[PDB]
Structure formats: structure tokens, C-alpha cells
Design a protein around this nucleic acid. Structure first.
Ligand code: MN
Ligand code: MN
Ligand code: MN
Ligand code: MN
Ligand code: MN
Ligand code: MN
Lengths: 460, 460
DNA sequence: GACTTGTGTATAAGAGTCAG
DNA sequence: CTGACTCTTATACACAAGTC
DNA sequence: GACTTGTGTATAAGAGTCAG
DNA sequence: CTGACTCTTATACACAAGTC
């Protein structure tokens, strides 16, 4: 959590114990990851800082047949495990994304849409660890990459196995820490076999309900049984404004709105397998006439008896969206789909390194995040703090304490172009990255002047 | 040509005499163009440097119903005319591009492809001025914007009129300088009416031949008449390697190759209108068995009698491609098609300003271009020169004179990620821009340190 | 000298993106 | 998904600065 | 101790992009 | 269009640095 800001130190902490069969391969991996992270989002060539040696080293590495992509990912994951020791409770957000390509190599990749689709690639199923107290991103725990064959019949295994395979790997890598982990998954994980496996291992989860299932004790579908349960209390949410574009391409507004939800919970036993677990039902009270009511039914191992316990389950699930944020940081952010390697294994090795660069992008912003009155020196070097103060002169908002962490956040965000168009105070990880990059880049000039003046040389 | 590097000075020189009906509108235009150029390629918000006032000013300007887009373009064009006074010969490259949009506003824009196409926008016909001695970009002379109607029958004028309309505007704005101007156009301008208009005005041109035409004196098609003309001599070209993707999407290599061409010329008289002009025919000698022979037939006002005169015509025409380079600098570079204004006039005003930002991108690189031994101080401030020397330390190639212009070019290009993958020594305008932006950004830190140390303040 | 338009501030929100 | 943002357009008010 | 793999240098070029 | 580039993969050689 501390090795983060300096790219070389971050890379070392993430990758230095990679088992690639040659310590030179491991050292090169550390260096490649370092230059990529320093120039997050940018090409291998740009990241080489004019060094032909570093450029050739980087390209040779990603096309190296003795370098296992799995072993790159595992090394990074074991670092996540290491950091996870610090926390009494963790959330393991789990979901699938695609990596889509259309250049020649696509021919050799797997199906994503139709058999006729030019866009081909991998499906990647990922587990992302958060600490469950303040929801900071701890890191990647697992990724399974596979290619979908054109003919379903040629598949070596069914794709619903992905949730169980992720659990098996999580279990194995976390060891005795697994009991601190709540897995969090959308409706696609609402699979009897998945629920059974988690409960069999005494493992913890919050999974959204998709299919109607009978409760043995009541003989009712979960929804109907939960509707009968006494109201625990309620909560209100603010759903913010956004544009929406649908599948065909039609555009409509979704205005901001308030919704009030009632909350209900209970212990349930699924007819199939006779397995027992908890459920929470959140349902909108008085939905507007022209809207579909909010409704979440969540299946969980967690306690749900009190209002506060049920609200915790609801809150845990609202953090599922972090993994989609990771997906964006991996693609738009780190450039997973901008890569143009010409062989599947080269692309895989490169894009596997970038999954870690992506996590850092999210953590970079979190390291600056706003009930305290911290100073900026806890996060920035004295030089960084001084230069930033120079750059932000006249821009500090009234509500920012002069040399505080909150000020530093806002000032770096301002360097990144943040203008707070919705007045929430929250800048995107992209804006924070841009600001951080701008500060670091300006710091090169700052320090160059400092160095020359230390040598006693006249400036300009 | 001198006001270029400092964005505020450049903007003033380009736009300060815009006739918009209120000097405040003109001042705002200067400021908007300045911030956009400083942050070339970047959004209005990023360009506002955290100033809410500048952001609101910029958005209000582009949606201002009292601001004519035509008057913005004219102002910039009159500056081109002004700079053109310095040169004894000019090339006026002329061509059309599209500006393509797919957001809501597209509905209100014109047809680009099929009636069913979601992509809609403007066609823009542009005249770009170069000086014909060293081929530096002088600036935009003319743009005609129009929307193609879904039904050809609703068109107020035929699109082939564009070449004549460009000539009429060029003529009008250049006045007596027109005689210094050679218009340069591809095969789409091979229109009798266009040739007649140029010759009627004693205007100069090099236009590639598309349609077979009879020569009166010989009774032959131009090609057959020119094939009979005595060989003037030849030349050899090196056609470089590139990938090619065709209309359907099929990929093939085009390997580098040498071609030898024979050169032939003559005076010709077109049967229709009885108009007299010159022609040059370049044709490949001994084409490889599996290739279509190189063949250019160019129609011109220029002398063609000697080998050197015909070679000059060929050379003039090889610079037509500059306008496509401008098109790229306007779209990919300056972000013409990244703009998301929600009304046609707003988009037009914004994208019209960006056409000038685009020209600057091309000129930025040209200002550093490599038979002399100049010093860097002719192009850079002493601070810029010192910082760059600090940044490039250890990267200077053997063939670069220590503090020269060539060194400065290469060093800024290296900051932009240039690694000379084809060993030509030529960096793209994009790489030079990136390097220049990086130098300027680092210069902020350099100068901040200089300022603090001048105030006697301890650094870090 | 009468009337309209721009600036800078605070506030609000529809449109668009990537993700899907 | 109750996403999480940035880009764009817009309003009132109190002056400043334009035009006719 | 015998054999294979990486590094850094010089050289070459196929693949891909935007433009079209 | 005889575009003008960047991204990617590749080769030889002379050592350095790995493995078995
Ligand atoms: Mn998902
Ligand atoms: Mn999903
Ligand atoms: Mn335990
Ligand atoms: Mn063209
Ligand atoms: Mn054309
Ligand atoms: Mn004259």
C-alpha cells in the first residue's frame, strides 16, 4: 500500500518474486512494468524514454516463449495476498470482461460475438480484492483467460465453471485468510452449484438473485417469502443523472431522482441440495407511475437479522461496480485493447502486465482520497508539495485547508483538468492520473533547475 | 512565421482582426484560440487551466449566435494572405475532406454515405498555401463547408463547383499575389470548366489527368500523343514499405521498391473550348511482371520544355499530399471529430477554430526542420535550450552538432517518443508536438524553481 | 442617451463515453 | 446498475462594455 | 564443465493507423 | 498515393549470465 507513487518501487513490489525460470526474465519484467506504469496508457516505445536497449528488452520480453503469462499474473496476485494480511475483512469482487481485437491476430483468437464477427479475443474472469472497512483496492487475486471456440461443442469446459474456478484459486492463494473474504457477484453467479460450493467450504458471499427458487420451509419462491417478512426499516438513495444509449443505439435521458426502499430479510433453505443461507430484499416504496420499481434480492452468508446487518449486505453489493471500474482502467486507461502484438501469446503477456498497471491507476486516486485533518506531506515529497503549491496558487477553494490532503487531491485533480461539472467534489481516476502525470512531468523541470543550481550553474 | 511558439501570440496574429461585430467577441476568440493551441488536441475544459471564467467564456463563444463561423475562417485566411507577401512563389493545395459525427446532432447534419448511415456531417473543401521554395506551410486560404442533402435533387448547387468557388475566393483574397500561386489538385479537379476558368484568368495550376481528352493538333488522346513525344530523360523513386487495408478490410503488405520512370511533355490544345496548356507524362520503365506500372499524366500552365521544367511539375504534384496531412492534423491532431457540440452552428464555430490549431501543429514541426549549421538559440529561449540539454543528456546521436538546430529537432522528437523505427531521421508532427508539449510542461517546473530561487526561497 | 450584449459568479442539468 | 464520471448548454444576477 | 538464454548494438522490414 | 509515419517482430554478432 506504501510502494505505489514511484513506478520502479511499485513494479518491484508487484513482480520481483515472479517464477519465470531465469532471474533475468524476472528483472526484465520488473523493468518493463516500471516503464509502462510511469507512462500509463502509453506505448512500449514512448515508455522506453529514448533507450533502444529498454525498447528491445521490452519487445523481446513480451514475445519470449520461456515467459509464462500465468506466472506473471500469479506473481502479482501473490503480492495482493501479501498486502491482504493487513485487513480484518475483505471483499472479492468477481466478474468477466472481454478483450476485443480486430487486427490480423484476431483470426487466432476466440469468439466474442457471432462466428462472422471481425472482433475476436479472450474472455477474462477476474477477482478484485478490496478492504471492506474503507473499500480501498488491495489488488488482483485471480484471472482466468480463455478463448471461446466458434463451435460450442469444441469447448473443453462450460463457462459457468468460471465462478467455481475463481473460488478454488482464491481459496488456495488466500489460505487461512479466506474466512475474511466476502465474494461479491452479479446475477450471472446465481447458480446452485456455485452457492453449494461456497457454503460447503464455509465461504462468504453476497450474490444477486436472478432465477426464482423455492424456499423449503415456506414452499414459496424467495421473493414471495421475503415479501411476507416484517419490514426492518428503510433507506433513501439519490440516483444521479446520466444519458443512456441502448443496444440499437437510441438515446434517452435518465434524470436524477430520489427513491425510497423498504428492507426485508430472512433465513432460507433451497429445495435443491437442502442448503441454508440468508437473503435480503430491497424494494421501492411508491415508485413513480412511469418507472419500473427498484428491486434487489441478494443471497448471502452474512447476518441479516437487524436493519444494520441487512444494510451492510446492500452496501457491500453497491461496491460490485468497482470491478467494472477496473475493466475501464485496464482498457481505456492502461490500453489493453490498444496493443497490436501479432501473436496471441505476445498479446497475452503484454496485456497481463497491463492488468497490474490498471489496478495502480485506481490506487493512485485512492491514495489521495477524502473525518480528519491530514497534511499533504503524508502523501507528497517536500519538492512535490512545494511545486504543487506553486502551480495551484490562486485556485484553492475556500473549503480546502491550506496544506492538507484534501487540498493536494483537489490541486492534482485541477492539474488534470477537473472542473467539477456536477458539483460532487469527486474527480475521476483519469483526471487524477492526468494531474499526477503533469505534476511529475513538471517535477522533472523543477528538479533539473534544483540540480543545476546546486552545481552552481547560472539558470538561463 | 515568427509568431508561432507562444500560443497567445500566435492566436493574436491569426485572429485579432476578426470582424465579428463586437471587439469583445474578437478578444474572446483570440483567448479561446490561445488556450486551445496551448492544449492542442485537448478538450475546452482541459484548456481552461482550472479557470471557470475561461471555461464559460469559451462555451458561450462557440454557441454565440452573433458570431459568424465564416468570419472566423476569413480572419485566419487574411493572416495567411499577409504572410504570403514574403514569398515569390506559392503552392495552393486544394482538396475535400469530411467531418463525421454520430451523436444526436448528426440528425441535423448532411449526408456523407448512404441515406441510412448514422455518420453525418459536413464536406469541407480547403485551400492550403505552401511556399514553393522550401515547401513550408504558410496557412489556410479558403474553406467551403456544406451539407449534402439526402436527396440530390434538393442541392442548391453541384459539388464540382467547389474547385471554381475555391478559385474565386483565392483570386479575391490574394489580389495581385495570385500570379505567384500554382494551384495543385488531384484527378477530381480534371473538369473542363475548371481548366477553362484557370486559363481564362491567366492562373497557374498542376492538375492530375483522369478522363481521356483529345488534343486538337494531333487528333489523339492526351496519353497517346504524349507517348509519341521524345523522352526528356528519367528519374528514379524509392517507394517505401507500408501495410495496406482495402475497402472490404483485407490486409496485404506493400514492400519497399525502386521504380524508374521516363518523362515526356508537350503543349496541348483541348478540342472542347479550344484551350491550350501543357502536359507532363511520367511512366514506369520495366515494371515488375506482377505490378501495375506507375503512370502520372499532369495538366499544367507551367513550362515543361526541358527535363528540369518537367521535373519541377512532377515535384510540385508530389506535395499535394500535404493537404491530407492537414486533414489528419485537423481530425486526429486537433480533435475536430472529438467535439460533441449539440447544435450544428456550435460545432461549426468550434471546429473552424480548430482548423487553425491544426495548421499550427504542422508548422510547429516545420519550425525545427533540417545545407547549413544553425544553432538552437535561433529557435529556442535560453531556458528552453538549457532544460532540453539537461533532458537529452546522453541521448545525442553522433551525427548531431552539440547545440545545433538539428540537435534541437532530434531532442524534442526524443521527448515525444521518437525512436526512428525506419531509420529515416524523420519524426511525425505528432511526435514533435508531444515532445514540444513535454518540454513546455517541464519548463513550468524549471521556471517555478527559477522564480522561487530568485525570491530567495529554499527549494524542497 | 437609450438600449443590447459580454463577463464573472453560482447553480442546474441534459448529452455523451466507456463499460456493456 | 442504484455505474461514474466529463462534456455541453443553460439560467439569474450585477455590473462592464458594447452598438445605434 | 558443458550448453542455452539474455543483453546491447546495428540493421531490416512486415503490420497497423489515419486518411480515405 | 509515388502518403507518412509508429508499432511490432526479427536477425547477427560478442559477450554476460543463466541452467543442468
Ligand atoms: Mn460486468
Ligand atoms: Mn457481469
Ligand atoms: Mn481464518
Ligand atoms: Mn483527398
Ligand atoms: Mn481528393
Ligand atoms: Mn502580380
Amino acid at each position: 500500500t506504501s510502494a505505489l507513487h514511484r513506478a520502479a518501487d511499485w513494479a518491484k513490489s508487484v513482480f520481483s518474486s515472479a517464477a519465470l525460470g531465469d532471474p533475468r526474465r524476472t528483472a526484465r519484467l520488473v523493468n518493463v512494468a516500471a516503464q509502462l506504469a510511469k507512462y500509463s496508457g502509453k506505448s512500449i516505445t514512448i515508455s522506453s524514454e529514448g533507450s533502444k536497449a529498454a525498447q528491445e528488452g521490452a519487445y523481446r520480453f513480451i514475445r519470449n516463449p520461456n515467459v509464462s503469462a500465468e506466472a506473471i499474473r500469479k506473481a502479482g496476485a501473490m503480492q495482493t495476498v501479501k498486502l491482504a494480511q493487513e485487513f480484518p475483512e475483505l471483499l472479492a469482487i468477481e466478474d468477466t470482461t472481454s478483450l476485443s481485437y480486430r487486427h490480423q491476430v484476431a483470426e487466432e483468437l476466440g469468439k466474442l460475438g457471432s462466428i462472422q464477427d471481425k472482433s475476436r479475443g479472450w474472455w477474462v474472469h477476474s477477482v478484485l480484492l478490496l478492504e471492506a472497512t474503507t473499500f480501498r483496492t488491495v489488488g488482483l487475486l485471480h484471472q482466468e483467460w480463455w478463448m471461446r471456440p466458434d463451435d460450442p461443442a469444441d469447448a473443453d469446459e462450460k463457462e459457468s465453471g468460471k465462478w467455481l474456478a475463481a473460488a478454488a484459486t482464491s481459496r488456495l492463494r488466500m489460505g487461512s485468510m479466506m474466512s475474511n473474504v466476502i465474494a461479491v457477484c452479479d446475477r450471472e453467479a446465481d447458480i446452485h452449484a456455485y452457492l453449494q460450493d461456497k457454503l460447503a467450504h464455509n465461504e462468504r458471499f453476497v450474490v444477486r438473485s436472478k432465477h426464482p427458487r423455492k424456499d423449503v420451509e415456506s414452499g414459496l419462491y424467495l421473493y414471495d417469502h421475503l415479501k411476507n417478512q416484517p419490514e426492518l426499516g428503510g433507506y433513501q438513495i439519490s440516483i444521479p443523472q446520466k444519458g443512456v444509449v441502448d443496444k440499437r443505439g437510441k438515446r434517452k435521458n435518465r434524470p436524477a431522482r430520489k427513491a425510497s426502499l423498504s428492507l426485508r430479510s430472512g433465513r432460507i433453505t433451497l429445495k435443491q441440495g437442502n442448503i441454508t443461507l440468508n437473503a435480503v430484499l430491497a424494494e421501492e416504496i411508491n415508485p413513480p407511475k412511469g418507472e419500473t420499481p427498484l428491486k434487489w434480492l441478494l443471497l448471502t452468508s452474512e447476518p441479516v437479522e437487524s436493519l444494520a446487518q441487512a444494510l451492510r449486505v446492500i452496501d457491500i453489493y453497491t461496491h460490485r461496480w468497482r470491478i467494472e471500474e477496473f475493466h475501464k482502467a485496464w482498457k481505456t486507461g492502461a490500453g489493453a485493447e490498444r496493443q497490436r502484438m501479432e501473436k496471441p501469446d505476445n498479446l497475452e503477456r503484454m496485456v497481463s502486465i497491463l492488468s497490474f498497471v490498471a489496478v495502480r491507476l485506481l490506487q493512485l486516486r485512492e491514495s489521495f482520497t477524502p473525518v480528519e485533518s491530514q497534511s499533504a506531506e503524508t502523501v507528497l515529497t517536500p519538492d512535490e508539495c512545494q511545486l504543487l503549491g506553486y502551480l495551484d496558487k490562486g485556485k484553492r477553494k475556500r473549503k480546502e485547508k491550506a496544506g492538507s490532503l484534501q487540498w493536494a487531491y483537489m490541486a492534482i485533480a485541477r492539474l488534470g483538468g477537473f472542473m467539477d461539472s456536477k458539483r460532487t467534489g469527486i474527480a475521476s481516476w483519469g483526471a487524477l492520473w492526468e494531474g499526477w502525470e503533469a505534476l511529475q512531468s513538471k517535477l522533472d523541470g523543477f528538479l533539473a533547475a534544483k540540480d543545476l543550481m546546486a552545481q552552481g550553474i547560472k539558470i538561463g
